[PDB]
Amino acid sequence: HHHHLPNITILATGGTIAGGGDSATKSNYTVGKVGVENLVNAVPQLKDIANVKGEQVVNIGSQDMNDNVWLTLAKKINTDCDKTDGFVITHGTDTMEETAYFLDLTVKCDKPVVMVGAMRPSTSMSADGPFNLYNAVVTAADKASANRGVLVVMNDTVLDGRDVTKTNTTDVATFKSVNYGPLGYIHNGKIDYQRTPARKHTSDTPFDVSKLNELPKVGIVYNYANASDLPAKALVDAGYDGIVSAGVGNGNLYKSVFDTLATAAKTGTAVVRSSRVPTGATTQDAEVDDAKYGFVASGTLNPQKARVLLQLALTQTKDPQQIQQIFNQY
Amino acid sequence: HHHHLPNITILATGGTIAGGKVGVENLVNAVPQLKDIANVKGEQVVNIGSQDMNDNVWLTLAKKINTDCDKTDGFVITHGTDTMEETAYFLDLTVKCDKPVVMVGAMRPSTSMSADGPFNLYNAVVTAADKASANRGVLVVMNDTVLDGRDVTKTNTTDVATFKSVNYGPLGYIHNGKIDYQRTPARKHTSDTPFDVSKLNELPKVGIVYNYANASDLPAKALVDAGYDGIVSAGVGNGNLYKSVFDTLATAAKTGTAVVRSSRVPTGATTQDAEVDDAKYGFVASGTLNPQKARVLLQLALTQTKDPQQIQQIFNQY
Amino acid sequence: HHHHLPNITILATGGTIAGGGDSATKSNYTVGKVGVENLVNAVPQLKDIANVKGEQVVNIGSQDMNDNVWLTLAKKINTDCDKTDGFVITHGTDTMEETAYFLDLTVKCDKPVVMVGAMRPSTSMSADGPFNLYNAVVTAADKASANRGVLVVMNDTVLDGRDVTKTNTTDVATFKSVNYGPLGYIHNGKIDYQRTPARKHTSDTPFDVSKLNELPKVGIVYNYANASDLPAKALVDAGYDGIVSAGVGNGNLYKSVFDTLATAAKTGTAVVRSSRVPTGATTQDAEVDDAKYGFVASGTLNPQKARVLLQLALTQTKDPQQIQQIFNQY
Amino acid sequence: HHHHLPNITILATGGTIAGGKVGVENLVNAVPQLKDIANVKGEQVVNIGSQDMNDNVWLTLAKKINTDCDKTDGFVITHGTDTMEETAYFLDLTVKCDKPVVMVGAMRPSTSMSADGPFNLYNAVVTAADKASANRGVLVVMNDTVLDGRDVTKTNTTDVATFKSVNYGPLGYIHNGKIDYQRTPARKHTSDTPFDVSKLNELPKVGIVYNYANASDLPAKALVDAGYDGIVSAGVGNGNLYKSVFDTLATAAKTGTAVVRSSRVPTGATTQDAEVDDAKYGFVASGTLNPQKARVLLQLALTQTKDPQQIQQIFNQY
Ligand SMILES: N[C@@H](CC(=O)O)C(=O)O
Ligand SMILES: N[C@@H](CC(=O)O)C(=O)O
Ligand SMILES: N[C@@H](CC(=O)O)C(=O)O
Ligand SMILES: N[C@@H](CC(=O)O)C(=O)O
The missing domain is CATH 3.40.50.1170 (L-asparaginase, N-terminal domain)
Known part of the structure; x- marks a missing residue:
């Protein structure tokens, strides 16, 4: 041998x-x-x-x-x-x-x-x-x-x-x-x-x-104090399939950003809440009623990672709850 | 007592x-x-x-x-x-x-x-x-x-x-x-x-744009079209920019918008002298200031000066 | 229901x-x-x-x-x-x-x-x-x-x-x-x-x-510059079944400590090399020929953890190679 | 030039x-x-x-x-x-x-x-x-x-x-x-x-002893029997001592051996005012000095003084 x-x-x-x-x-x-x-x-x-x-x-x-x-x-x-x-x-x-x-x-x-x-x-x-x-x-x-x-x-x-x-x-x-x-x-x-x-x-x-x-097509928007809603509006105006939010803290959004994303979500744009914070999950059942707005919580996926999974989720489904399940399994 | x-x-x-x-x-x-x-x-x-x-x-x-x-x-x-x-x-x-x-x-x-x-x-x-x-x-x-x-x-x-x-x-x-x-x-x-x-x-007015693979230039352009005073880039790695974002920001920096390269990476400085010639483009490197911290300093810098070199010195001192 | x-x-x-x-x-x-x-x-x-x-x-x-x-x-x-x-x-x-x-x-x-x-x-x-x-x-x-x-x-x-x-x-x-x-x-x-x-x-x-x-009975000895061999000798004199060394760096030993432990090992005292360093393994195939001296490398087990496994290993075997295998499996 | x-x-x-x-x-x-x-x-x-x-x-x-x-x-x-x-x-x-x-x-x-x-x-x-x-x-x-x-x-x-x-x-x-x-x-x-x-x-001469569950007092006693000038304890948690080690060290501190409580824990201070009355026993708390660093300072302290309170002040200043 x-x-x-x-x-x-x-x-x-x-x-x-x-x-x-x-x-x-x-x-x-x-x-x-x-x-x-x-x-x-x-x-x-x-x-x-x-x-x-x-x-x-x-x-x-x-x-x-x-x-x-x-x-x-x-x-x-x-x-x-x-x-x-x-x-x-x-x-x-x-x-x-x-x-x-x-x-x-x-x-x-x-x-x-x-x-x-x-x-x-x-x-x-x-x-x-x-x-x-x-x-x-x-x-x-x-x-x-x-x-x-x-x-x-x-x-x-x-x-x-x-x-x-x-x-x-x-x-x-x-x-x-x-x-x-x-x-x-x-x-x-x-x-x-x-x-x-x-x-x-x-x-x-x-x-x-x-x-x-x-x-x-999936873009990423950043939150911070006095955040502009212009980035989010730009993605929505271009017909993006998905938007990921780099939220503050536990996936939270500046109100003008929140307003634009809530509207997009009800027109069929997929919206994932992630976090600019470098570790930890963006959870369900914190300050944002995801079920109400048709949002998906990213869990431990950071914004650029959440983009990857969202793009792939969108090849299978546009349904927020099915997308949320994907974000819970992959 | x-x-x-x-x-x-x-x-x-x-x-x-x-x-x-x-x-x-x-x-x-x-x-x-x-x-x-x-x-x-x-x-x-x-x-x-x-x-x-x-x-x-x-x-x-x-x-x-x-x-x-x-x-x-x-x-x-x-x-x-x-x-x-x-x-x-x-x-x-x-x-x-x-x-x-x-x-x-x-x-x-x-x-x-x-x-x-x-x-x-x-x-x-x-x-x-x-x-x-x-x-x-x-x-x-x-x-x-x-x-x-x-x-x-x-x-x-x-x-x-x-x-x-x-x-x-x-x-x-x-x-x-x-x-x-x-x-x-x-x-x-x-x-x-x-x-x-x-x-x-x-x-x-200072906004933040995010970099990632295949990043859109639409956010950067939306800030430019609204006449923002400054844009902070949350770059990849050592403050690097996706090409289309780099193109938009290069233009902005010569067209009345201050541009600071920061990083989405949670620790470490965005330095000069790596891949981007800040001087050529009129950009400022953020050092250890993350995007939201860099925004703060850039808004205050713009109350004193619109000059990129003076902005760079502010970013080196405060 | x-x-x-x-x-x-x-x-x-x-x-x-x-x-x-x-x-x-x-x-x-x-x-x-x-x-x-x-x-x-x-x-x-x-x-x-x-x-x-x-x-x-x-x-x-x-x-x-x-x-x-x-x-x-x-x-x-x-x-x-x-x-x-x-x-x-x-x-x-x-x-x-x-x-x-x-x-x-x-x-x-x-x-x-x-x-x-x-x-x-x-x-x-x-x-x-x-x-x-x-x-x-x-x-x-x-x-x-x-x-x-x-x-x-x-x-x-x-x-x-x-x-x-x-x-x-x-x-x-x-x-x-x-x-x-x-x-x-x-x-x-x-x-x-x-x-x-x-x-x-x-x-x-x-x-x-x-x-x-x-x-x-398993004790722990600490290494540092100018380390005393007196702790190690004390454990050996008392008939301890095992000694764990909190080594410097990658499980390394001050020479007088090394000498006492080498001797103990050839009389049937079990000797495990661990590290005072808080993360990382104490590896085989670094500066200490474990096979030669009859020592066991602790891997990622810190000294107090290595004590736990060594005590339990000693209820089954006193053979250094069998103890090393235990330290590779549990 | x-x-x-x-x-x-x-x-x-x-x-x-x-x-x-x-x-x-x-x-x-x-x-x-x-x-x-x-x-x-x-x-x-x-x-x-x-x-x-x-x-x-x-x-x-x-x-x-x-x-x-x-x-x-x-x-x-x-x-x-x-x-x-x-x-x-x-x-x-x-x-x-x-x-x-x-x-x-x-x-x-x-x-x-x-x-x-x-x-x-x-x-x-x-x-x-x-x-x-x-x-x-x-x-x-x-x-x-x-x-x-x-x-x-x-x-x-x-x-x-x-x-x-x-x-x-x-x-x-x-x-x-x-x-x-x-x-x-x-x-x-x-x-x-x-x-x-x-x-x-x-x-x-300053030696280090380790604490863990069921710790032997034999190392501490061996240092005491050799007339060591000082002993640093690598304590558990906030510089705590297994009972038998605590007993030996309590005795040493009244019998010509300086005793410093440090910690095996890799970060954080060994503080006063937690579970151990340092004053009563004549012990010194190491602060953020780990056992081997505390040894260093304790050897140098013992070139100036053998008094536990003066040693404690050294550990608060250097
Ligand atoms: N969303 C809350 C989070 C917190 O205070 O922990 C806030 O920033 O006002
Ligand atoms: N800009 C380089 C940085 C690196 O590879 O370290 C790249 O990602 O290709
Ligand atoms: N045992 C070597 C380890 C090293 O230098 O990396 C030394 O401390 O001398
Ligand atoms: N000395 C205490 C410390 C604690 O529980 O935090 C103990 O381990 O029992």
Whole structure:
């Protein structure tokens, strides 16, 4: 008997992991500049753990991530599932938490899908990207990683795609699953998993994007003192399918915003209450009678995460109570 | 001789601490031990949910504290928790009275099991009565902790421990009616700022737009079309902008709208010298000021100047 | 059909939850002074949710918790399992994280066992104990709480007995599962569970204390700069069955401590390396050759938690590799 | 004119940053960009794993910095991460040079993927070269953050982000070779302390005992039997003691041993006025000093006084 290593496919999309600047010790850089081959060759130990094939899907900053790249990724992974043993997606950190949840809801492939990025560009002193990439490959190669949904691997930690969020603007340790914690930690190329997400993911969801050319239009409005209703009116005037509110506190709304959203809701615009507050649920049965206004409470989904689920909910139903049930199950 | 207690004024604005329905007099009467530490007088300013806080109320409060500073030894403001962090920083920048100003709220209703409001109110008075609390800026006192009004933010939607100074930490902790202060904010506040709202009846209009994958430019454009004085971007990561939002804001910054890049990310600074050439576009980087805190400072900046470089310096000093 | 509420048994042991002082606004108080009936009557809403029966097992500060109280609790719960639908144990906060893990490893009852305490005495302004008790009863009454091991409920949060730890000396929010997160959050008397512990617990462990009169002797030594080997020598001289080291960093030992523990280990004293560092695992394959010295690495178990598992491991085996396997499974 | 760079001295002590095997000269030569910010000179003090740090090394370091203060513009100490928090606070209390003293280490070996040591060393030099870093006490620089030597502690066994000032927060963050300081420690340090180790060759013996359910009194008794000068208790919760440990320590405190109650709990103060009457027993409460930090302060306290009340006041001031 001979040892054979798993086959792992790297789908590259850009990010600071592929960023470069002209100095190792200045901060300035350009994103999504370096190709997948360069990233792979910067981690010569990858041969110890996997047979790696790299594909460049796009090369962008994830600040410019969009619905089309999401559809491209989901369809590619679902199509290519039988060709490989696992996937790593290199991506910008800014919207990784959004792409990861989208994929968590739409990947039907039963093989690990692991997202990874870097907070320092590839050119920087002590760049984090090479070890992050190694650890993402370790996770994608570990049989125990299966059936846990779509994962994010950053800073030696395996995080579920639903709860994971970027907590700090600059810190290499930025990614945390702030409400329910990580799934496992990586030490010396091994993972000790102690958790798995309960919410339904991947092959257990009804969302099937195989034939979609686009996704429903869902925007986000922010609340604060003296908030303008103009953003909300703009989305309503454009015929948006859904609006997510980044509420204050427990999903609360400035009154003018509340008035515009209540009206939209009774015309069939889906309205989800989420929170600008970085941890905790936007609950039912607090200060807003959701049943009365036809609103949906986001639970622990932050506004950008709630957008992901709402867009997908709107491919199935426009009924607020059915949308609320979706927000209680996925 | 005869022992004497400080005179503390409670300015009530509403909130769950008053659940925004119970009056200042009932709040006070419900914590009879306040008599052990101060001579409390209450005045009702408004009685609202802080999700409906607004510029008018802010102006009322700053004017009242500045006017009444001589009459009292310190102030406590009872407020909703939802926008307490905004009001705190507004007052931090506009209050000229060097005597303690302490804001407090509650996460649980006064009738709920283990309501937090009573002890929160007690400790806010302790803080307002402590001579060591002077000259530290406007404060927030919650969950046995004294927090500076610049850094303090609501971190959790329901936890009594929600309020934290997430970038630089608290100033001190309160135990047995005493505070051990170990920090003070270095940014200029109160009487060391140029902001003076004594004669203003309105504040520059400043709105906030959110960034996310596939973000619409419609919110940003709606603010521009209404002639907003300023727009704060709740950027992704280190204050980055979705392309269409970036395009709209680039235009606004050369067309009479001040533009500040902040971040939806809950901790850390939005820096210069990363991916965005702020100088080229005429944008301002917010540093550790989150979008709603950056709005506050940007409205006050626009009372002095419309020049992006002078705005950037304000954002580096206050 | 008529609604019937679950039967819940409160086993009271003391703590600040049962503490009292002479003023509502001074900090001074005496622990474990108030009886179970008083605690129950301070939460008049408990009738809305359960039929509550209180038993006083002991009335102590949990700083004086000990092996005999642990054995008493485990045997009582296992004996009385069929008499009730769920248990709440009122307890001091100082060692709750130790009792909870002991119970997590030794309870064979398939009904929820929920531990609760209070950081402020019963006499204090804004005392946390009454709502903590309510929420513990809610958790013990929820069918979904079953099969999750022994739980700790504090500050609106349901925490697993293994990972839970006291993080702050004074804060009502002190209890966190610092490595893997909470299992669920409580809002308006309802729990949305999103996690369950993977490590084996309760009826899935081999530990059976039904007939034990005592537990193996296990002590803890602390490392720091210029550490004394005298504590370690004292435990060895007394014939201790086990010693847990609160190491520096990743389970590292001051050399004189290391020398004494290496010697003890080769005479059959079990030696577990843990860490004084509050989060993260004490790993294998770092600076200490555990295989060589016959040591066991504690993983994420902190020193007092590692003591619990080691005592129980020593009821089954004295073999270091079998003990290491136990530390990898429970 | 001609631009001039500060002179910075690296004092090397070992650690994973040197993995304790590589010499100061290789460390320095591996970050050639240090030349852009300083004139670096290195000196080897020892080359050890900091799990074997000891009083002798502490005394060497304090004496060397105090002696060499005039010769340089700032210091960086390369050190293991395991006891860096102890050495930092020792130096914080004993260094009399008001010029920046910055400690640094690394969580990953220099040969590992994405090793942290190089940028950590670069930023430690930035900090040591910043004129704004003077008069803030001894510092720890890790993961782009400037932390005070009193509050800083290792929070995680392996994370590069492990070091945090868990009670009062960091002093500033480092970005693009610049620091925005927003805090400074209020406790007295360096030249405002009475501790002077210039002529000492040994320090008072102080040991640490741990509390847990069913704790043995054997460790505490072993320290007492050896005539230890002081014992720090790593208490449960708010510095509480298992009965048998409490009994032994009560006796020690009246029998020539200073006793400080600290806590195994990683954050928060061990306070007076909770369950233990410190005055009655002659114990000292540690405040926010964890057991190993309390040991440091208690050894230095015992160089001035053996009186528990004077020790308590030291613990309230430094
Ligand atoms: N703007 C970059 C930031 C990063 O990757 O860290 C991106 O998200 O693509
Ligand atoms: N919505 C309430 C929440 C609270 O006070 O806790 C307020 O901000 O007025
Ligand atoms: N010493 C008390 C502290 C508390 O319960 O909060 C105990 O653990 O019993
Ligand atoms: N044991 C090493 C750990 C490190 O430096 O990271 C030391 O403290 O010397």
